[PDB]
Amino acid sequence: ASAPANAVAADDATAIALKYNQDATKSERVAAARPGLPPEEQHCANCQFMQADAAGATDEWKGCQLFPGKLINVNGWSASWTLKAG
Numbered sequence: 001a002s003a004p005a006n007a008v009a010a011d012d013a014t015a016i017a018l019k020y021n022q023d024a025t026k027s028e029r030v031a032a033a034r035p036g037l038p039p040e041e042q043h044c045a046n047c048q049f050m051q052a053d054a055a056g057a058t059d060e061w062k063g064c065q066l067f068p069g070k071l072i073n074v075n076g077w078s079a080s081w082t083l084k085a086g
């Protein structure tokens, strides 16, 4: 439940550029509708680019390639998601 001290801020420069919503339920994913899988089934957990092996990862909060020294919620989402197809 509780967010980690280093939660990626939704309003971080990176989160802005990426449109990282932190919550997939509220996420613009619905509109952004990335290819691969329907928006409802998209979140960081399924993201090709996610560093699961983040230095400090935990189940709810994994690392994103572009967001070092913070963690993104696995049930969050951003624009450059891409369904894990590799």
Ligand code: SF4
Binding pocket: 018, 020, 043, 044, 045, 047, 048, 049, 050, 051, 063, 064, 065, 066, 072, 076, 077, 078, 079, 080, 081, 082
């Ligand atoms: S690139 Fe992937 S892991 Fe990183 S914030 Fe976007 S959806 Fe999440």
